[PDB]
Design a protein around this ligand. Sequence first.
Ligand code: CLA
Ligand code: CLA
Ligand code: CLA
Ligand code: CLA
Ligand code: CLA
Ligand code: CLA
Ligand SMILES: CC1=C(C/C=C(\C)CCC[C@H](C)CCC[C@H](C)CCCC(C)C)C(=O)c2ccccc2C1=O
Lengths: 124, 742, 147, 144, 80, 165
Amino acid sequence: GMLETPVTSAPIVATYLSNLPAYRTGVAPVLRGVEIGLAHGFLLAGPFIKLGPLRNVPETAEIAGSLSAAGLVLILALCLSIYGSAQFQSARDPLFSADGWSEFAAGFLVGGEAGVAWAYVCTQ
Amino acid sequence: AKKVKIAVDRNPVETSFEKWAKPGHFSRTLSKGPNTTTWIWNLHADAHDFDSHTSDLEEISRKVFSAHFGQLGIIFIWLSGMYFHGARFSNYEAWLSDPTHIKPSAQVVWPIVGQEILNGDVGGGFQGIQITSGFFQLWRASGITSELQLYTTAIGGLVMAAAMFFAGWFHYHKAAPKLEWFQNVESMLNHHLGGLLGLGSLAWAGHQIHVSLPVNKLLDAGVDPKEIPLPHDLLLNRAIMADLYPSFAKGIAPFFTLNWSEYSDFLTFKGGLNPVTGGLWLSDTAHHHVAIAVLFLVAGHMYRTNWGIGHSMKEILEAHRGPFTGEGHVGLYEILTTSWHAQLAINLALFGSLSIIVAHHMYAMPPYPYLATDYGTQLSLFTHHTWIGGFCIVGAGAHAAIFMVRDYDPTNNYNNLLDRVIRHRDAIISHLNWVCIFLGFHSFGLYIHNDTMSALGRPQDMFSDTAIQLQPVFAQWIQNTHFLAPQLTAPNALAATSLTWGGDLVAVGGKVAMMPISLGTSDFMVHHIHAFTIHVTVLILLKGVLFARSSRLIPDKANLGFRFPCDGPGRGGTCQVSAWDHVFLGLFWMYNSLSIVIFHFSWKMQSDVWGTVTASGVSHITGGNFAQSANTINGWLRDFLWAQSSQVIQSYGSALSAYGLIFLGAHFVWAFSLMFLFSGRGYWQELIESIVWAHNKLKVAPAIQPRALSITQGRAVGVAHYLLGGIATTWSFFLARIISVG
Amino acid sequence: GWVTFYWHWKHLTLWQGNVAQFDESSTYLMGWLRDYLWLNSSQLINGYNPFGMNSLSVWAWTFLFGHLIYATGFMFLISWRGYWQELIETLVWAHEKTPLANLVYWKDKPVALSIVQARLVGLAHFSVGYIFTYAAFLIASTSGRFG
Amino acid sequence: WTVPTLNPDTPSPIFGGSTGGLLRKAQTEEFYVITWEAKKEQIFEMPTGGAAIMRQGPNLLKFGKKEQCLALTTQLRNKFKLTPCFYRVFPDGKVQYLHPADGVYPEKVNAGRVGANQNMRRIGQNVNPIKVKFSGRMMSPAEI
Amino acid sequence: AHIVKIYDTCIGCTQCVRACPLDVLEMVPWDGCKASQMASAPRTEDCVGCKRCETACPTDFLSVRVYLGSESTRSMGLSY
Amino acid sequence: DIAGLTPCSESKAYAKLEKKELKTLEKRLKQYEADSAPAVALKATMERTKARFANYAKAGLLCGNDGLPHLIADPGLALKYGHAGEVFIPTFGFLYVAGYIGYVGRQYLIAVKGEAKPTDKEIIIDVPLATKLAWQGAGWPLAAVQELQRGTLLEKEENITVSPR
Ligand code: CLA
Ligand code: CLA
Ligand code: CLA
Ligand code: CLA
Ligand code: CLA
Ligand code: CLA
Ligand SMILES: CC1=C(C/C=C(\C)CCC[C@H](C)CCC[C@H](C)CCCC(C)C)C(=O)c2ccccc2C1=O
């Protein structure tokens, strides 16, 4: 069969993945979308603020960077939505279905924008 | 316990010109003679492919052994010519008197069709082509002071060349070693470690201690070369040597009584560069070769041959067995004693990597007198030995794939290191694939980021020392550690091994020989370009070796062979799947990667090291513009290629006008090659049909049917012309530039 | 290219009044490389430099932009399909075995470009880089000199 | 001769495994199974890369595409003089048998086979492309 | 699926059948040649278009011809 | 003169060009000795330079505003004004040699087609035959024309293979 390896087949690694929102079955797709969106949205603000074109402005740097992070989350939400449209047109987990993914994309937008807003509040 | 012994066969082959008159005799396919022009190319392509002429390993080994004598004989003719031309067509004797003002020259052209203009004014009342091979500096270091000494070496070189060709004939036609002789790897390593490298180093130490050191000590003192004692007078008269080095007054008793400190006057550990000549101390070099001689002579007593003591190489390999690697190194000993290609793959890899290491160490620690201040020699030697190393490494991939197709046998390799590597090749190539993509974005993308920010009028947004900074902190730490080594970690060394680490510059004849090299943001960016282009070359070559036998596209690629064009247009198209084609593609990337290496060296040296010393300070050739300009692609185009190519394009009408012609001619050959790379033989075979019709119409059609080159030969002809044109273009550009200003 | 180089160089010398340069330097190929391509690139490649930029920085940027598209075309013309199809097969393997990414999947099986497609794609890059490089040089050399 | 029936419980060669094996296609579209009898335990080369030991008696392997199965078949026949046969297996559980289609390898002529895609003319006697134009689809003159 | 056609110049050498790496071709009885056998292409849905059969045909011009046509998972030689 | 050109012997720019080349050589000369090897070589070059400029003027060439010789290719203009030696005469000089080489090779190729193994006579040249044909080629224009009139120069259209059409 496939080449066995500790990275591919280890107990500690398997348990960690099984607890991630993507693999945690039994949770509504919308809730998983919010949990995933919040984590990525919070991180997405970092690089824009520190290395953006308006990084050296004292107060505008925080606003401009976070506002660009919010924009990228919006674009990503569109990518999630159209992916579901193309992939699911006609199985065990509700997420991998036309109904499930549409809820998942909506949750990501709500969670992602909340994370970007929450990141801004931390700064000011 | 097969004894190690000499074993030959008497008169294996007859010496006759009969087969010289029967082209293709070596191969069954070509022995029948030509019917199409394809036969002619096949004759030269398969001439030295011994492994395919016969399936007998003994017959293959005997041809390899004698073909090596022919290579040695050719080098001696070449070496003899270099020494002879130094004696008869050079200004070496004048150069010894005024090394800092006279340009070395050892080639003279005849006065025909107006080519005598190439005999430039080089100094010493001599006209000739300036040479960048560094032979004058080598001869001075060894102690050569007259053209008679050069002449005798050339005559000795021809005698050695005759001996080498006799040996090849003798050991193929008269007394050919048997296969069991060739397979004494333990014995060969013992002799080559302690005998070739070991005694060779000791013998050269004898020359340096007795000839080079006394002669160069007086030359540096200003003594006229003609008034220096001859090397044999130094050897016969211990009184003379005692004057230069008092340690000689005690003879060899200190060596045998272990009072080795008595020889401190000529066996030194100074470090640094000789201030008078700008090269390494020869007393340091002598202690180096004496130390190296002992290390290798000890190394030559490690393997067991006939007297029990020693190691068995098979036993070492089979003992190194771990939990993560299955059987381990089992089966490698049989692979490496029955496959010439496997041996060649290893040796080319390390021999090529060694040639690249030589280039870095020789420029940073100039080992010859007046080598450093001769910028043309420094640039040429570094660039020459980088190109040699590059080609050898690509060959290592080529002959690793040949082993994989021809000499690989699954029965002998089951669950060993070799087998397990093949069983996760997708994991290796997929990861190496991602690393190359990552390195391409985060190294070349930075240049594109800088070029766009600069064009938009946003210099503060660029990656540079005056902007967002990328300091090679790790390299800078190592430079400082080596600079302070003599204080605490190498107490008995007087100076740092190189002046690149730090300290003060050494100037010879008003020119900088070596000074500290600073690493900044531009150096950070260029180095990660090197890592990118090297990693890609590994990807192409390693992919060819791992997928030589099969892939998910061609499950039976081994049966097709090592060198085939494709498996047809099916499966979407299978052009260039053979392992030979991975060498073909790997050659382009090796050329791409080494071109940046020699551009990096050329611009960094001119900008930051080379220059003229004056009262105020050091003025460099390009005035320190590397730091601010080499962070954009536009900077390289304008400041390096466009500005420095001024010398080559203005060469007409001068002694350097030859470089101008070759600069254009090289551009031509390179573009000519794209005809073979961008086309296919289907078009050309149809074109020849119409051309053949015209000859048939005139009863002048050849008997050997014209054929368009094969698919593989089109790719081989393309890459050979592409490399020759590209490399020759840089060669002309470098020499016309550095000779003109350097 | 030969036609437009000939038209451009013969007119630049006329527009500067020094027709003698073309008459003397046009009879050998070093004159073209030296006195036409190298001599007239001085202003183009200074559109932006470590000291600043001017109105020619767009043509300087487009000049290198052309060289890049041209060189990218060599990849599609020199290296052919079989190499790339086998490389893509390890990328398909890597995606399927990667956790947290094999949740996403493709609908069209990735494959290398076809034999015929890569010739067109390589020729398109070759032509575009060809055109954009000379357009930037033609306009920049002529406009900066007089305009 | 009758069509053999596949036995899913047939033992498989001694193989550690590799990364060149089946992919997600096998679980969604199809895969291929090759079976044969071995006179003695021997080492052979896997078309997916590596070496495997064939057990004495029946052996069974699974491959991702047909060409891989027929590549192993050539190796077994030419070197080991064996007589392997392989199937096409679908995810729904259906099994399709092929090679040898009728029990005799195609290289050997056998009565009962019906010629297919045979044109009783030469290549030079095909019609011109103009005469098969606007036939509803791109059609070569050889097709008609 | 590709198109594979056998023409009446076949001499029944069987080289095309041996060359084929996907068992697309086979030999059938015939009376139009000395060998009394002709090549057949009953399983063209498995053809990949390698044209190894055309490489192996001795007759001039070829007696077996492959016309690349519509692509699919099998004809594109994919294992994924 | 012709096309606005002037004889090089009467051209001011042509004369100035000679001084420039001699001046360059003289400048290098004064850094050597009177009769040293480099000095002798430079003096030899200057003699050839002076001879070259005298020969081209004596030949009656035409110089342009650049002060460099230009050649006349029209046969009518060449013979009209005595420029036949520039292009016209060398035209028939080359064709004789070019036809010589081609005719000799064609004779050899026909000669070996009658042999048992023509291919082995092409990689391994039959030197005795080649030398025989090399000397007889001096009369190729006469032999070439007679073949044309007798109709044995060209193959028949029916004996030449062609592709389907
Ligand atoms: C005059 C002496 C002589 C004679 C008559 C023979 C005769 C024979 N030898 Mg022997 N041989 C000789 C000397 C001689 N050898 C020497 C000196 C060596 C040591 C290198 C060898 C090594 C040797 C080997 C290893 C083999 C033979 C073989 C042969 C046979 C065929 C050789 C052939 O076809 O050569 C014709 C080939 C050439 C004329 C090529 C010459 C190549 C040399 C090395 C010059 C290289 C120049 C180099 C490329 C220059 C750069 C080129 C660049 C400027 C373009 C034949 C029985 C072969 C044999 O028996 O096969 C069954 C065989 O495998 N010989
Ligand atoms: C102390 C012994 C000794 C020495 C010095 C050498 C030296 C060499 N061997 Mg090695 N070799 C040895 C023992 C030795 N070998 C033994 C015991 C075996 C059998 C197991 C081999 C088997 C072997 C093979 C199979 C090959 C070599 C080759 C080489 C050469 C590699 C290229 C090089 O560096 O050229 C450097 C060049 C020089 C130093 C100048 C020329 C050679 C000088 C004169 C040293 C001669 C050493 C010789 C063994 C002394 C006896 C010669 C004769 C009187 C019997 C090199 C000359 C390769 C080669 O190139 O062969 C031609 C090669 O193919 N050797
Ligand atoms: C391989 C390297 C090498 C060689 C060949 C030599 C050689 C020499 N060294 Mg040097 N030396 C070396 C390395 C070497 N050295 C190193 C590494 C060091 C640093 C430790 C030194 C340090 C050193 C010192 C400090 C001195 C020398 C000296 C000498 C000379 C005399 C040695 C002596 O007393 O020998 C004693 C005896 C022998 C070596 C045996 C000789 C055997 C002969 C050749 C046998 C001949 C037999 C034959 C059948 C007879 C001919 C018959 C025929 C005519 C018919 C001698 C020229 C001395 C000298 O004079 O310097 C100027 C000296 O003072 N060396
Ligand atoms: C120690 C070095 C070494 C040795 C001994 C060999 C030996 C061999 N190689 Mg390997 N190889 C090497 C280095 C080496 N290789 C390197 C560095 C590379 C990378 C470029 C390769 C790449 C390579 C490939 C890709 C192949 C081999 C093959 C072979 C085999 C047949 C070679 C042959 O017939 O050539 C005959 C020689 C020629 C046809 C002459 C080539 C002339 C070149 C192209 C000229 C280039 C320009 C010139 C140097 C300078 C200008 C010339 C001027 C006239 C304009 C043979 C076993 C072939 C094989 O089948 O192996 C099993 C094969 O396919 N090698
Ligand atoms: C300038 C010409 C050029 C370029 C840009 C490339 C680029 C590449 N080659 Mg190719 N190649 C070339 C010439 C070129 N090649 C030639 C002439 C040959 C024939 C010898 C080959 C032969 C060849 C082989 C055989 C291989 C490559 C590989 C690669 C890749 C290296 C790794 C990587 O992904 O880097 C990162 C990508 C880049 C640096 C490209 C430029 C990226 C820009 C600057 C930034 C991105 C733009 C940004 C997103 C904005 C887009 C906006 C737009 C959408 C509107 C890469 C795609 C290797 C590969 O695939 O490795 C995985 C590989 O195996 N090449
Ligand atoms: C390649 C084509 C070509 C061209 C464009 C020319 C052009 C010219 N030729 Mg030349 N000529 C050519 C080939 C050519 N010639 C050839 C192959 C030959 C035979 C070897 C000649 C023989 C020749 C002679 C003998 C004369 C010219 C002359 C001329 C000039 C005016 C007449 C003329 O030919 O008009 C256009 C050309 C053609 C239509 C092609 C055929 C030209 C024939 C062969 C010559 C016509 C001469 C004409 C009747 C002279 C009348 C007197 C004149 C002063 C008006 C003109 C510069 C005349 C001259 O010197 O004028 C100053 C002149 O006397 N030519
Ligand atoms: C130009 C070209 C050709 C045509 C080139 C050919 C046929 C090679 C020509 C070699 C020489 C010039 C011909 C043989 C010369 C003889 C040895 C006789 C010469 C006699 C004297 C003049 C020396 C291909 O065959 C080809 C094949 C595959 C991909 C690309 C190409 C390709 O680009």
